[PDB]
Amino acid sequence: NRGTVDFIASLENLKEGDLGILRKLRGARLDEKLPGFDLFSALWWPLRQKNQRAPKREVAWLIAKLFAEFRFEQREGATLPILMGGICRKLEPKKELPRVLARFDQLASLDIMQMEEPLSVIMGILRKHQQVCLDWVGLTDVLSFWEQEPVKREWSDSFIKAYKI
Amino acid sequence: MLIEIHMIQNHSPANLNRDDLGAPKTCYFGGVLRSRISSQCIKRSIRTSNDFKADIALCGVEAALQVAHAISTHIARPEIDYFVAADDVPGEDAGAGHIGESMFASACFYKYFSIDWEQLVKNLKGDTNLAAHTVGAFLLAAAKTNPSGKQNSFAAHNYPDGILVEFKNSPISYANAFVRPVSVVKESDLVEQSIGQLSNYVNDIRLGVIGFWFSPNNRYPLGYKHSKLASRNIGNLNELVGAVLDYIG
Amino acid sequence: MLIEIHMIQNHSPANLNRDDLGAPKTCYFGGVLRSRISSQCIKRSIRTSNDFKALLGGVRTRRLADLIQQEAGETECWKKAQEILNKCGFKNTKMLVFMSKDKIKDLARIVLDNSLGLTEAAQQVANVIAQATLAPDIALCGRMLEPNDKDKDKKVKWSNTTVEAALQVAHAISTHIARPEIDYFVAADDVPGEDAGAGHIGESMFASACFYKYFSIDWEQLVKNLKGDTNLAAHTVGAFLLAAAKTNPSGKQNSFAAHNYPDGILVEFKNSPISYANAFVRPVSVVKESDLVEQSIGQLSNYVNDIRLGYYDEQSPVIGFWFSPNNRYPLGYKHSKLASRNIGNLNELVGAVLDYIGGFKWEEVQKS
Amino acid sequence: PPNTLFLRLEGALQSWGSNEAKFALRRTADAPTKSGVLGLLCAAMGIGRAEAADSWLPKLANLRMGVRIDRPGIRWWDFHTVGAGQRTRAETLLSRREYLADASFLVALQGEPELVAKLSAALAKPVWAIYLGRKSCPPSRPVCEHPPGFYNTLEEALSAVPLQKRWHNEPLPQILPCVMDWIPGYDGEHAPDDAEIHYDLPVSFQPPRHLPRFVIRRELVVGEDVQVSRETGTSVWRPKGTRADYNNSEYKKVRAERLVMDHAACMVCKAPATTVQHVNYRRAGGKEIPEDLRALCRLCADACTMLEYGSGMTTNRIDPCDPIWRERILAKRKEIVEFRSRGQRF
DNA sequence: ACATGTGTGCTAAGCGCACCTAATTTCCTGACGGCAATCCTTACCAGCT
RNA sequence: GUGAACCGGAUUGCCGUCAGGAAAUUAGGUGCGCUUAGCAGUAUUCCCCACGCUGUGGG
């Protein structure tokens, strides 16, 4: 898509104070603080009048909050079920692998709003394994259509494919 | 003239039809495995109880019914159970029972009925307005008592939500609406998504009669347009019964 | 005539029921995962409840000969009892047998000890087992009995053991998406050592959910299996109402003391029962205002509205009840002012439902 | 001139019985038998019982035909427990039935247009509760589809009909098996040594007495005469709703109506008004009726966007008229007054 | 979900950061309980209608 | 209406019963927002009844 790329690139332009106030708004809707809504409006309004396709609003808000909290860099080919699974091969299959594996499968049966904390723990173990790159555009357009089961099964089969290799 | 009671029916988790080994019965449609109750089971459940008997010319000239297998609008989801019957008398150890396994499934179903003109008039019994009275009993007696099954341990008698009655005479089941099993998107219900699929099929086929539609307190509209795909978005108990009564005669 | 009893219970983080692997029970209701509590666990916990002790009169044992041997000071009859049972039809110490406790105790003791026969002794023991219907827990839960046809005698028969269950407990369906939570526990070794580690690193799974609990009484069946009397029937109905409102499943309560109480009672008298599972086909997602209990009650009251008007049964209206304690949780917050007898107690609703049952009172019936 | 009608057999379940069923194992065949479409025919005329044996089975028993497999459905077995003397004694009788699941067919009926002309007005309007050969197996497609026409040969008629497709990304059988009868090209012709015998030829109907027939296999690849059809008909609902209309031609003119209907003023916190908010998002608005909008000042419309953008987006709106959404609006306006940075836009 | 309610009259251009950084040992449960029937006969025979 | 009719796989079930995730941690050092300004002014003040034509009722 040619609309989400501008959103991710504009997010990468954000300076320290803006993503600090985005960091402070974890688990909080974009209403109880005025500056957070102002920042989201500035990020989210001008990309609908230049390109016809835009992500969903809740996906954009959640992705902005998570991006502020973790601060990765955008790189093609680094979606969640590849780096996930790649880290699962670096594990003991007896005990820890079912633990981390269940932590990953918790994402596949959740709605967009409640995934903030499971995505937080998944990206926390990603940060523990020193992962710098994450395809924010790829994550965003597989998350804006997260409610159709073909993309969920494709994401899971990507995890399988990265695990068997 | 022909009566097509296209009926949706969600079900709380409980097993209703059991095969040799105890599983919920299944069918194959749309390239997927979907849950199924047998037409014999629901047809006998329409009999064998006195609430409907308030009909021996209709399930016996043979009989007068076409009841389809309950095709699920989505994929089958059979689950399994694990029960332990306790000892309740203190022995040297604990646990005594069969320690077996049961199994159940929750599904949203569909079926189709057929009562023709002479198939109801020559049914007769003793009257000519009986060919309207028995049908008028049927259109909501088909949605009166969920069959039977393991109800003493899996209590499920969920009443249906969305009921169609058509007066189209060409016998066509709308099962081709459920060629694609119904997926779930967060903003709509499973029953609401199934009813949207049924509505989307309804807007087709007319390109190449009426739509008498039942929604209790019209919570489920057949199409989110003023150009309603049934044009009869009403329904309250025996109002529909009497309206079919003076539709037939 | 049959009685419906509905509850909406929110529970603390707890594991009241597990499968073989230890996970809380789950069902795929409405296309999404719903937390489940097994009906048999609820039936057992209400059976073993602290108020059923005046009515707890059923035993499900395979150690019948042990029960005979306990009530015999010096007359050892445990091999003779075992062979009498082994040719009764049970083949082994046996399979599970349901009966009344005191009846089998005293009169199987008197019918077993006498040295008058061995074949007809087994026949009359089997008849005593089959006639043991004077217990209302058997009348509620139900019981059949199938002995073997191989390890038996051709001269031993069995009467019709038909007992119908007068209770249909539904499985407690969660009112939202199930969020199964993983608990990580260790076991401390009390004595120290070099390793400074745990005695047993283990797995436990717990689920915090608002359960839609659903029971149903077949009072007509409850008296067609409890003979012509109605006093015991009314006492059992009141005892179940107290027990269900008062007791909880005895799962991992020592580790999760979730003894929270039902925040909703809906008793409706009719001849066509209904579960409000379709009230929550749409999963309940909470908003910033209100709480999960109120949103669940709101969806339930919306469903009660369009099944009291769209599916109206004004030939037999609803006698819909509540347990709204001093009206803390009202039902009709926007339109549903159909709660005819909204109260804030439990003994009052017990007395009311036995009043529409017939001419009974709460205190007078509580003596059978 | 149209000598053939193409019967369309399609449903969730269907079964045309085979010969190997006298006992409780009741089976089917992987083709609609001759007396598995002639029973449909007799029901479509509205008669049955012993009337079909005379002048209805021999009225077309001299007429050859051919069948086509759109998709080969799989064989399914259903448990069936007849209760006998239970709804004699309670001895429950036992059985097992064979069901062909998700199979579409196309039968031909060739030779002359008078009987086909009588038959064309027999599939849609005249009925005796027609089904797919089994009483409890409904036809899911209009059986009167694939209109008649002249195609002289069996293969030309069987391949000159468009082939459907349910969804776009669906596997399609590239070889369509053809079941054809025996054509006696000359008198004394002997059948080829691959033609299996099928026993679907009734000479009476009740009780069933039968004759055998010769069946010749035949093949059909797609492309030369048969081809895919237009699908359309979106089987995806996903409730509709428009969005993001600044102006086509009817927002400029419709903003002013409630601007000066309310006398250039606000409504909640009355003050000179700038813009218009939208309530009751039944339609987001290309054509808007003038009794749903809400001309309303800058700060409290910003508070309306406060409340809407937070929490659910949905289709229900704020409607600052009924006083339940009042305290939140005023509080959000207070923090708007306290914390707005005009130099940081908006 | 910036535009459009200007109302004497509301500027504006230059400028926005780089780098070192993430550890491990060991610990992980035993036993007991697991359903019976009934869905074609060595068919005549005697309790009694 | 047709190798098809008409047709239950039925009843009995607590998975229960033991468990600290504990030991250790400076959030680190760098920085000017800033260059320019009368809240004044008679010679039509947008009006509508309305005066010998500038007093008189208000939008």
Place this chain on the structure above:
DNA sequence: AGCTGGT
């Protein structure tokens, strides 16, 4: 005197 439920 036959019939029917049991062996």
